[PDB]
Amino acid sequence: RTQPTTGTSGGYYFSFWTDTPNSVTYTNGNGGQFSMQWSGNGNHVGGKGWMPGTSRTIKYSGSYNPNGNSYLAVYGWTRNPLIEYYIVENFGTYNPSSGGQKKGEVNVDGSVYDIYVSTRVNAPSIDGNKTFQQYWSVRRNKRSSGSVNTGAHFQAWKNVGLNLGTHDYQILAVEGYYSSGSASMTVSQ
């Protein structure tokens, strides 16, 4: 029902999705800059990056302030197989990987990441209502700026049998779910 607003800004791909537009303000700034402010009802996800994604190093910085269900993550999809993946850098009052099956750990970029897989059934995807897996790398030491070696995560996932398909988009995403929060982030390489 609800398509993400997508396009280009500042030399980056961007995607912004919400099922409740009046609850959220998403703004594209210059270069890799974007901001999101949300509160009250609804599910909101937005950010800037690359279409398609690859094993690139992603640098980011800025301010991320969650007040409830929320995450800051490198966020992307693959196809064949259909995979929604997350490299979670920060989050609020609730670990988004909750209920994921833990597959291992990876030490990269100055922290250990816990690796999980979950299945989502009959859910929205880059290919409509589908059943797909979610891959999670969740940073134990939360942060709001730094560098993410996505290839190191992809390889770590592979080493525990979480194989990826062909890349679709890859963004630095800020997400809120029936919560409040705000962020002002800048992506780069």
Numbering used by the authors: 2 to 190
Q: Can you list sentences taken from the study reporting this PDB entry?
A:
Overall, Xyl2 folds into the characteristic GH11 xylanase fold consisting of a highly twisted β-sandwich core that comprises 14 β-strands and is further stabilized by a single α-helix in the opposite side of the active site. The groove delimited by the long β-hairpin, commonly denominated the “thumb” region, and the curved side of the β-sandwich or “fingers” region defines a long, wide valley into which the xylan substrate molecule binds, or “palm” region. The general mechanism of glycoside hydrolases (GH) starts with the nucleophilic attack by a carboxylate nucleophile (Glu176 side chain) on the anomeric carbon of the scissile glycosidic bond, resulting in the release of the linked sugar residue and the formation of a covalent enzyme–sugar intermediate.
The final model contains the complete amino acid sequence except for the first and last amino acids (residues 2-190). The N-terminus of Xyl2, however, adopts a particular conformation and, instead of running away from the active site, it folds into an elongated motif that forms one side of the active-site groove. Comparison of the Xyl2/MBX and the unliganded Xyl2 active-site structures revealed that, in the unliganded Xyl2, a glycerol molecule from the cryoprotectant solution was found in the active site near to the position occupied by MBX ligand. In the observed conformations, Glu176 side chain points to the bulk solvent, which causes the side chain of Tyr72 to concertedly flip over to a less hindered conformation. The present structure confirms the poor activity for Xyl2 at this pH since it presents a concerted change in the Glu176 and Tyr72 rotamers, with the nucleophilic Glu176 side chain being kept away from the substrate.
